[PDB]
Amino acid sequence: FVSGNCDVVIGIVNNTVYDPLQPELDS
Amino acid sequence: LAGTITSGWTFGAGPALQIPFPMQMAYRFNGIGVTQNVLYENQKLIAN
Numbered sequence: 868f869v870s871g872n873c874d875v876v877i878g879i880v881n882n883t884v885y886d887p888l889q890p891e892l893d894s
Numbered sequence: 895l896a897g898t899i900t901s902g903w904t905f906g907a908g909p910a911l912q913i914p915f916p917m918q919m920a921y922r923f924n925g926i927g928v929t930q931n932v933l934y935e936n937q938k939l940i941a942n
């Protein structure tokens with residue numbers, strides 16, 4: 868779940884969050 | 895004291911498993927019905 872930006876949390880890292888609905892958008 | 899700081903509650907029910915203290919505090923906030931992001935967004939305020 869999403870809450871806020873990437874500035875107030877100490878220790879946050881880059882990564883990718885996969886979206887299940889996007890592959891279904893094509894068809 | 896050393897166990898409950900470096901391992902939380904894990905050492906009382908088995909082997910001691912390390913976990914960072916600010917992250918352990920997030921677990922305990924969840925116990926009282928408060929989301930994790932509340933702690934992480936006020937870590938400097940809570941610690942003080």
Ligand SMILES: *[C@@H]1O[C@H](CO)[C@@H](O[C@@H]2O[C@H](CO)[C@@H](O)[C@H](O)[C@H]2NC(C)=O)[C@H](O)[C@H]1NC(C)=O
Nearest residue numbers: 872873874875876877878879880881882883884
């Ligand atoms: C997570 O990815 C973001 C991508 O925006 C990184 O933020 C940038 O980091 C570079 C490198 O220091 C800076 O020059 C930029 O100013 C940052 N912001 C933007 C909008 O580009 C961020 O550093 C990454 N997190 C980690 C821990 O590497």
